[PDB]
């Protein structure tokens, strides 16, 4: 049995990064990317509360900006929930959330890899480093 795996992609900036990044940051970014994994009919994501799920597109953020195909997985709903429980007791306790270094995209990337053997695109995972490499990022870092 094979089950489709999707990456739901949201621009937290609602198009503002694309417009304002050159003046704010000195560099062109296309979005402030938040992602989640949709598999077995639910949308899974990370945060300071730990691992959570909503119906797909049913978080506070609403419908995604893009739905990206990751691949297919043999992992059943029951095994996946055991896996997520393991993650949440170890590396994805809510306390470990860090906006730049251990975020919702860190989660989605490691879940994608477990389920399909693929990583998510670097342009999402590298965003925090792009921001930090700027006077803006360095000045607003401690606020964090
Ligand atoms: Hg929700
Ligand atoms: Hg994020």
PDB file of C-alpha atoms and ligand atoms in Angstrom:
ATOM      1  CA  UNK A   1       0.000   0.000   0.000  1.00  0.00           C
ATOM      2  CA  UNK A   2       1.352   3.429  -1.061  1.00  0.00           C
ATOM      3  CA  UNK A   3       0.228   6.758   0.410  1.00  0.00           C
ATOM      4  CA  UNK A   4       0.848  10.208  -1.126  1.00  0.00           C
ATOM      5  CA  UNK A   5       2.943  12.673   0.868  1.00  0.00           C
ATOM      6  CA  UNK A   6       2.532  16.455   0.351  1.00  0.00           C
ATOM      7  CA  UNK A   7       4.401  19.510   1.577  1.00  0.00           C
ATOM      8  CA  UNK A   8       1.998  22.397   2.234  1.00  0.00           C
ATOM      9  CA  UNK A   9       3.865  25.641   1.644  1.00  0.00           C
ATOM     10  CA  UNK A  10       2.846  29.012   3.134  1.00  0.00           C
ATOM     11  CA  UNK A  11       4.347  32.477   2.703  1.00  0.00           C
ATOM     12  CA  UNK A  12       4.060  33.948   6.245  1.00  0.00           C
ATOM     13  CA  UNK A  13       4.657  37.395   4.715  1.00  0.00           C
ATOM     14  CA  UNK A  14       1.702  37.180   2.300  1.00  0.00           C
ATOM     15  CA  UNK A  15       3.859  38.486  -0.550  1.00  0.00           C
ATOM     16  CA  UNK A  16       5.568  41.249   1.501  1.00  0.00           C
ATOM     17  CA  UNK A  17       9.031  39.581   1.489  1.00  0.00           C
ATOM     18  CA  UNK A  18       9.057  39.586  -2.313  1.00  0.00           C
ATOM     19  CA  UNK A  19       8.299  43.301  -2.421  1.00  0.00           C
ATOM     20  CA  UNK A  20      10.227  44.540   0.644  1.00  0.00           C
ATOM     21  CA  UNK A  21      13.238  42.199   1.006  1.00  0.00           C
ATOM     22  CA  UNK A  22      15.631  44.287  -1.162  1.00  0.00           C
ATOM     23  CA  UNK A  23      15.128  47.413   1.043  1.00  0.00           C
ATOM     24  CA  UNK A  24      14.829  45.573   4.387  1.00  0.00           C
ATOM     25  CA  UNK A  25      17.520  42.950   3.840  1.00  0.00           C
ATOM     26  CA  UNK A  26      19.629  44.028   0.810  1.00  0.00           C
ATOM     27  CA  UNK A  27      18.707  40.774  -0.986  1.00  0.00           C
ATOM     28  CA  UNK A  28      15.816  39.249  -2.940  1.00  0.00           C
ATOM     29  CA  UNK A  29      13.725  36.691  -1.060  1.00  0.00           C
ATOM     30  CA  UNK A  30      10.493  35.345  -2.532  1.00  0.00           C
ATOM     31  CA  UNK A  31       8.738  34.389   0.677  1.00  0.00           C
ATOM     32  CA  UNK A  32       9.012  33.735   4.379  1.00  0.00           C
ATOM     33  CA  UNK A  33       8.433  30.019   4.079  1.00  0.00           C
ATOM     34  CA  UNK A  34       6.464  27.955   6.600  1.00  0.00           C
ATOM     35  CA  UNK A  35       5.713  24.293   5.715  1.00  0.00           C
ATOM     36  CA  UNK A  36       3.848  21.285   7.073  1.00  0.00           C
ATOM     37  CA  UNK A  37       3.448  17.637   5.977  1.00  0.00           C
ATOM     38  CA  UNK A  38       0.073  16.356   4.756  1.00  0.00           C
ATOM     39  CA  UNK A  39      -0.201  12.562   4.803  1.00  0.00           C
ATOM     40  CA  UNK A  40      -2.948  10.137   5.884  1.00  0.00           C
ATOM     41  CA  UNK A  41      -5.496  12.991   5.660  1.00  0.00           C
ATOM     42  CA  UNK A  42      -4.017  15.342   8.265  1.00  0.00           C
ATOM     43  CA  UNK A  43      -1.643  18.279   8.284  1.00  0.00           C
ATOM     44  CA  UNK A  44       1.302  17.872  10.707  1.00  0.00           C
ATOM     45  CA  UNK A  45       3.538  20.680  11.902  1.00  0.00           C
ATOM     46  CA  UNK A  46       5.863  21.784  14.679  1.00  0.00           C
ATOM     47  CA  UNK A  47       5.913  24.874  16.929  1.00  0.00           C
ATOM     48  CA  UNK A  48       6.609  25.937  20.498  1.00  0.00           C
ATOM     49  CA  UNK A  49       3.646  23.802  21.556  1.00  0.00           C
ATOM     50  CA  UNK A  50       5.279  20.694  20.093  1.00  0.00           C
ATOM     51  CA  UNK A  51       3.995  18.569  17.197  1.00  0.00           C
ATOM     52  CA  UNK A  52       0.386  19.316  16.243  1.00  0.00           C
ATOM     53  CA  UNK A  53      -2.082  18.364  13.533  1.00  0.00           C
ATOM     54  CA  UNK A  54      -5.107  19.959  11.923  1.00  0.00           C
ATOM     55  CA  UNK A  55      -7.270  18.968   8.978  1.00  0.00           C
ATOM     56  CA  UNK A  56      -5.390  19.926   5.839  1.00  0.00           C
ATOM     57  CA  UNK A  57      -5.629  23.681   5.227  1.00  0.00           C
ATOM     58  CA  UNK A  58      -7.457  23.987   8.570  1.00  0.00           C
ATOM     59  CA  UNK A  59      -4.775  25.651  10.698  1.00  0.00           C
ATOM     60  CA  UNK A  60      -5.068  29.355  11.669  1.00  0.00           C
ATOM     61  CA  UNK A  61      -3.048  30.153   8.499  1.00  0.00           C
ATOM     62  CA  UNK A  62      -5.818  28.781   6.256  1.00  0.00           C
ATOM     63  CA  UNK A  63      -5.264  27.318   2.737  1.00  0.00           C
ATOM     64  CA  UNK A  64      -1.642  26.858   1.556  1.00  0.00           C
ATOM     65  CA  UNK A  65       0.058  28.993  -1.105  1.00  0.00           C
ATOM     66  CA  UNK A  66       1.429  25.865  -2.828  1.00  0.00           C
ATOM     67  CA  UNK A  67       0.958  22.103  -2.370  1.00  0.00           C
ATOM     68  CA  UNK A  68       4.164  20.343  -3.285  1.00  0.00           C
ATOM     69  CA  UNK A  69       4.396  16.637  -4.085  1.00  0.00           C
ATOM     70  CA  UNK A  70       7.053  14.931  -1.954  1.00  0.00           C
ATOM     71  CA  UNK A  71       6.449  11.323  -2.995  1.00  0.00           C
ATOM     72  CA  UNK A  72       4.667   8.219  -1.728  1.00  0.00           C
ATOM     73  CA  UNK A  73       5.231   6.291   1.486  1.00  0.00           C
ATOM     74  CA  UNK A  74       4.623   2.712   2.701  1.00  0.00           C
ATOM     75  CA  UNK A  75       4.328   4.023   6.319  1.00  0.00           C
ATOM     76  CA  UNK A  76       0.799   3.472   7.705  1.00  0.00           C
ATOM     77  CA  UNK A  77      -1.121   5.963   9.891  1.00  0.00           C
ATOM     78  CA  UNK A  78      -0.504   3.866  13.018  1.00  0.00           C
ATOM     79  CA  UNK A  79       3.285   3.605  12.456  1.00  0.00           C
ATOM     80  CA  UNK A  80       3.568   7.292  11.503  1.00  0.00           C
ATOM     81  CA  UNK A  81       1.824   8.347  14.758  1.00  0.00           C
ATOM     82  CA  UNK A  82       4.258   6.158  16.761  1.00  0.00           C
ATOM     83  CA  UNK A  83       7.095   7.804  14.840  1.00  0.00           C
ATOM     84  CA  UNK A  84       5.797  11.303  15.579  1.00  0.00           C
ATOM     85  CA  UNK A  85       5.417  10.428  19.229  1.00  0.00           C
ATOM     86  CA  UNK A  86       9.067   9.340  19.254  1.00  0.00           C
ATOM     87  CA  UNK A  87      10.107  12.648  17.623  1.00  0.00           C
ATOM     88  CA  UNK A  88       8.094  14.694  20.087  1.00  0.00           C
ATOM     89  CA  UNK A  89       9.657  13.081  23.157  1.00  0.00           C
ATOM     90  CA  UNK A  90      13.213  13.573  21.813  1.00  0.00           C
ATOM     91  CA  UNK A  91      14.184  16.237  19.242  1.00  0.00           C
ATOM     92  CA  UNK A  92      10.744  17.922  18.745  1.00  0.00           C
ATOM     93  CA  UNK A  93       9.671  18.812  22.211  1.00  0.00           C
ATOM     94  CA  UNK A  94       8.088  22.287  22.073  1.00  0.00           C
ATOM     95  CA  UNK A  95      11.083  23.637  24.050  1.00  0.00           C
ATOM     96  CA  UNK A  96      13.377  22.845  21.109  1.00  0.00           C
ATOM     97  CA  UNK A  97      11.516  25.182  18.685  1.00  0.00           C
ATOM     98  CA  UNK A  98      13.906  27.829  17.420  1.00  0.00           C
ATOM     99  CA  UNK A  99      12.834  30.156  14.662  1.00  0.00           C
ATOM    100  CA  UNK A 100      16.177  30.036  12.842  1.00  0.00           C
ATOM    101  CA  UNK A 101      17.737  26.680  13.705  1.00  0.00           C
ATOM    102  CA  UNK A 102      14.998  24.161  14.585  1.00  0.00           C
ATOM    103  CA  UNK A 103      11.674  25.267  13.080  1.00  0.00           C
ATOM    104  CA  UNK A 104       8.610  23.930  11.241  1.00  0.00           C
ATOM    105  CA  UNK A 105      10.707  23.419   8.112  1.00  0.00           C
ATOM    106  CA  UNK A 106      13.341  21.435  10.112  1.00  0.00           C
ATOM    107  CA  UNK A 107      10.410  19.179  11.116  1.00  0.00           C
ATOM    108  CA  UNK A 108       8.935  18.892   7.619  1.00  0.00           C
ATOM    109  CA  UNK A 109      12.351  18.121   6.144  1.00  0.00           C
ATOM    110  CA  UNK A 110      13.124  15.273   8.587  1.00  0.00           C
ATOM    111  CA  UNK A 111       9.555  13.822   8.222  1.00  0.00           C
ATOM    112  CA  UNK A 112       9.846  13.942   4.375  1.00  0.00           C
ATOM    113  CA  UNK A 113      13.139  12.058   4.607  1.00  0.00           C
ATOM    114  CA  UNK A 114      11.679   9.380   6.926  1.00  0.00           C
ATOM    115  CA  UNK A 115       8.592   8.866   4.760  1.00  0.00           C
ATOM    116  CA  UNK A 116      10.010   9.091   1.212  1.00  0.00           C
ATOM    117  CA  UNK A 117      13.775   9.349   1.501  1.00  0.00           C
ATOM    118  CA  UNK A 118      13.673  12.856  -0.047  1.00  0.00           C
ATOM    119  CA  UNK A 119      14.620  16.184   1.459  1.00  0.00           C
ATOM    120  CA  UNK A 120      12.537  19.339   0.958  1.00  0.00           C
ATOM    121  CA  UNK A 121      14.057  22.126  -1.239  1.00  0.00           C
ATOM    122  CA  UNK A 122      16.980  24.065   0.198  1.00  0.00           C
ATOM    123  CA  UNK A 123      15.416  27.426  -0.713  1.00  0.00           C
ATOM    124  CA  UNK A 124      12.958  26.759   2.183  1.00  0.00           C
ATOM    125  CA  UNK A 125      15.461  25.266   4.665  1.00  0.00           C
ATOM    126  CA  UNK A 126      18.149  27.910   3.936  1.00  0.00           C
ATOM    127  CA  UNK A 127      15.865  30.910   4.572  1.00  0.00           C
ATOM    128  CA  UNK A 128      16.784  31.481   8.228  1.00  0.00           C
ATOM    129  CA  UNK A 129      20.493  31.584   7.319  1.00  0.00           C
ATOM    130  CA  UNK A 130      19.819  34.139   4.512  1.00  0.00           C
ATOM    131  CA  UNK A 131      18.005  36.374   6.951  1.00  0.00           C
ATOM    132  CA  UNK A 132      20.759  36.042   9.612  1.00  0.00           C
ATOM    133  CA  UNK A 133      23.506  36.966   7.127  1.00  0.00           C
ATOM    134  CA  UNK A 134      22.115  40.516   7.041  1.00  0.00           C
ATOM    135  CA  UNK A 135      22.448  43.619   9.273  1.00  0.00           C
ATOM    136  CA  UNK A 136      18.643  43.381   9.811  1.00  0.00           C
ATOM    137  CA  UNK A 137      18.778  39.694  10.867  1.00  0.00           C
ATOM    138  CA  UNK A 138      21.721  40.368  13.171  1.00  0.00           C
ATOM    139  CA  UNK A 139      20.035  43.352  14.822  1.00  0.00           C
ATOM    140  CA  UNK A 140      16.678  41.572  15.369  1.00  0.00           C
ATOM    141  CA  UNK A 141      18.202  38.199  16.356  1.00  0.00           C
ATOM    142  CA  UNK A 142      18.076  38.569  20.171  1.00  0.00           C
ATOM    143  CA  UNK A 143      14.402  39.629  20.014  1.00  0.00           C
ATOM    144  CA  UNK A 144      13.871  36.156  18.425  1.00  0.00           C
TER     145      UNK A 144
HETATM  146 HG1  LIG B   1      -6.443  23.597  13.645  1.00  0.00          HG
HETATM  147 HG1  LIG B   2       8.713  27.843  10.148  1.00  0.00          HG
END
